Amino acid sequence: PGSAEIDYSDAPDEFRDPLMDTLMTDPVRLPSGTVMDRSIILRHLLNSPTDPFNRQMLTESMLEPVPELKEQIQAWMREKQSSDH
């Protein structure tokens, strides 16, 4: 297939993940109150049942997806795409 996307290098640091240095798209809140990317937290759980930047205990049942960031991210990505013709 020939499918492709706009480069999101213009995204703010509150939309980007720290490990992969890109737009997370799925923000997920931890029991510490910290927000992380869905894929980075589940990738660290495979190594140990702990947080990726502090190693306090963490389980999948303690996680909750963030709506107020995900709904802002999808609106922002729409404007980056509609700027092209």
From Swiss-Prot:
Post-translational modification (record): Proteolytically cleaved by caspases during apoptosis.
Source organism, top-level taxon: Eukaryota
Intrachain S-S bonds: none
Domain U-box, chain residue ranges per copy: 10-83
Tissue specificity annotation: Expressed predominantly in neuronal tissues. Also detected in liver, heart, brain, kidney and testis.
Modified-residue entries (Phosphoserine), positions: S48
Compartments reported by the entry: Cytoplasm; Nucleus
Assembly mode: Interacts with VCP. Interacts with STUB1/CHIP and UNC45B.
Annotated function: Ubiquitin-protein ligase that probably functions as an E3 ligase in conjunction with specific E1 and E2 ligases. May also function as an E4 ligase mediating the assembly of polyubiquitin chains on substrates ubiquitinated by another E3 ubiquitin ligase. May regulate myosin assembly in striated muscles together with STUB1 and VCP/p97 by targeting myosin chaperone UNC45B for proteasomal degradation.
Other information: In strain C57BL/Ola, a 85 kb region on chromosome 4 containing Nmnat1 and Ube4b is triplicated. Ube4b becomes linked to Nmnat1 and encodes a fusion protein located in the nucleus which is responsible for the delayed Wallerian degeneration of injured axons in C57BL/Ola.
Similarity comment text for this entry: Belongs to the ubiquitin conjugation factor E4 family.
Free-text note regarding domains: The U-box domain is required for the ubiquitin protein ligase activity.
Name of the protein this chain belongs to: Ubiquitin conjugation factor E4 B
Included stretch of the parent chain: 1092 to 1173 of 1173
